[PDB]
């Protein structure tokens, strides 16, 4: 966008009769430009060339000419491989895009704001959530599985890094002998859920 | 930037002055055309009003 | 690359070229301006005219 490169004092404004091209000329034409663009179209005014703009690939020149000159100007700018942009410089267009712009930014970091802060809350309330009904669920399945009453021995674990072997061997014995063969994935001694974490 | 801007501005101020002062001319040549047009068909209805009048 | 006469001679042109555009509309306007007269007076005359033969 131009938003950032033109300004207002590079161009003459409510012209009677000229009307102003903009040029982007390779920079190994750059030189070449600045003198052949001179050539490009009957009744350009002189020394009224210069450069508004530079990039490492190209840069961006503007120039006045009559109005009737546009096409000509265009076409042999074309022939000589310049890009020409036709951009008529409008204050009010490239300031409404600035404030909207900045609108956006403001109002994206406005929301952001109180959203996390909004979120932060709730998502630490889904997961006391998630907490309260895996222990119900491990309630019922408690109940379902041994009967009543509802004194269950029910422990959260903390594993030992490399213990998950002897944590099942310890956790078979102490279980397994006092219920059946009856109770992995299906068949546990114990009421067992994964809390990823 | 300065030449081609002097430049233009007075060629603006120039095509400016010539088609304003024709148009001035023609909205005073407009006038000057119902007037005439005034005063001889007023003098028209005044010959009538005699022929009028000695019929009468 | 260019001397002072040669871009000196087109800034003169295009000095020149606006204000020759500006004269021709200025002349165009004045035959324009004829014209309306005459128009205007025709009709207005004609029909004021009619009023009076009418009236009469």
Same mark, same amino acid.
């Not at chain 1, 000509?72 to 909207?100: L, S, T």
């Not at chain 2, 000057?32 to 005699?50: C, G, I, S």
């Given at each position: 966008?131009?938003?950032?490169?033109?300004?207002?004092?590079?161009?003459?404004?409510?012209?009677?009769?000229?009307?102003?091209?903009?040029?982007?000329?390779?920079?190994?034409?750059?030189?070449?430009?600045?003198?052949?663009?001179?050539?490009?179209?009957?009744?350009?005014?002189?020394?009224?060339?210069?450069?508004?703009?530079?990039?490492?690939?190209?840069?961006?020149?503007?120039?006045?000419?009559?109005?009737?000159?546009?096409?000509?100007?265009?076409?042999?700018?074309?022939?000589?491989?310049?890009?020409?942009?036709?951009?008529?410089?409008?204050?009010?267009?490239?300031?409404?895009?600035?404030?909207?712009?900045?609108?956006?930014?403001?109002?994206?970091?406005?929301?952001?704001?109180?959203?996390?802060?909004?979120?932060?809350?709730?998502?630490?309330?889904?997961?006391?959530?998630?907490?309260?009904?895996?222990?119900?669920?491990?309630?019922?399945?408690?109940?379902?599985?041994?009967?009543?009453?509802?004194?269950?021995?029910?422990?959260?674990?903390?594993?030992?890094?490399?213990?998950?072997?002897?944590?099942?061997?310890?956790?078979?014995?102490?279980?397994?002998?006092?219920?059946?063969?009856?109770?992995?994935?299906?068949?546990?001694?114990?009421?067992?859920?994964?809390?990823?974490? | 930037?300065?030449?081609?801007?002097?430049?233009?501005?007075?060629?603006?101020?120039?095509?400016?002055?010539?088609?304003?002062?024709?148009?001035?001319?023609?909205?005073?040549?407009?006038?000057?055309?119902?007037?005439?047009?005034?005063?001889?068909?007023?003098?028209?209805?005044?010959?009538?009003?005699?022929?009028?009048?000695?019929?009468? | 690359?260019?001397? %002072? @006469?040669?871009?000196?001679?087109?800034?003169?042109?295009?000095?020149?070229?606006?204000? *020759?555009?500006?004269?021709? /509309?200025?002349?165009?306007? %004045? @035959?324009?301006?004829?014209?309306?007269?005459?128009?205007?007076?025709?009709?207005?005359? *004609?029909?004021?005219?009619? /009023?009076?033969?009418?009236?009469?």
């Amino acid at each position: 966008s131009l938003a950032e490169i033109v300004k207002k004092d590079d161009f003459v404004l409510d012209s009677e009769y000229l009307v102003t091209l903009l040029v982007v000329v390779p920079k190994l034409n750059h030189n070449d430009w600045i003198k052949q663009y001179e050539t490009l179209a009957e009744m350009v005014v002189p020394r009224s060339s210069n450069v508004l703009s530079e990039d490492q690939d190209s840069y961006l020149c503007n120039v006045t000419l009559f109005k009737k000159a546009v096409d000509d100007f265009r076409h042999k700018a074309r022939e000589n491989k310049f890009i020409v942009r036709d951009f008529q410089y409008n204050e009010e267009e490239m300031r409404a895009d600035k404030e909207e712009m900045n609108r956006l930014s403001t109002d994206k970091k406005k929301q952001f704001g109180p959203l996390v802060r909004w979120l932060k809350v709730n998502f630490s309330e889904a997961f006391i959530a998630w907490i309260h009904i895996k222990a119900l669920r491990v309630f019922v399945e408690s109940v379902l599985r041994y009967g009543l009453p509802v004194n269950f021995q029910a422990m959260l674990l903390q594993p030992n890094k490399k213990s998950v072997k002897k944590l099942r061997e310890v956790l078979h014995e102490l279980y397994k002998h006092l219920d059946s063969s009856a109770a992995q994935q299906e068949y546990y001694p114990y009421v067992y859920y994964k809390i990823d974490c | 930037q300065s030449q081609g801007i002097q430049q233009l501005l007075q060629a603006e101020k120039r095509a400016a002055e010539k088609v304003a002062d024709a148009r001035k001319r023609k909205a005073r040549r407009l006038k000057q055309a119902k007037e005439e047009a005034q005063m001889e068909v007023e003098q028209y209805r005044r010959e009538r009003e005699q022929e009028f009048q000695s019929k009468q | 690359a260019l001397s %002072d @006469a040669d871009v000196q001679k087109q800034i003169k042109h295009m000095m020149a070229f606006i204000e *020759q555009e500006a004269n021709e /509309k200025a002349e165009e306007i %004045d @035959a324009k301006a004829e014209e309306e007269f005459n128009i205007e007076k025709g009709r207005l005359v *004609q029909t004021q005219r009619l /009023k009076i033969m009418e009236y009469y």
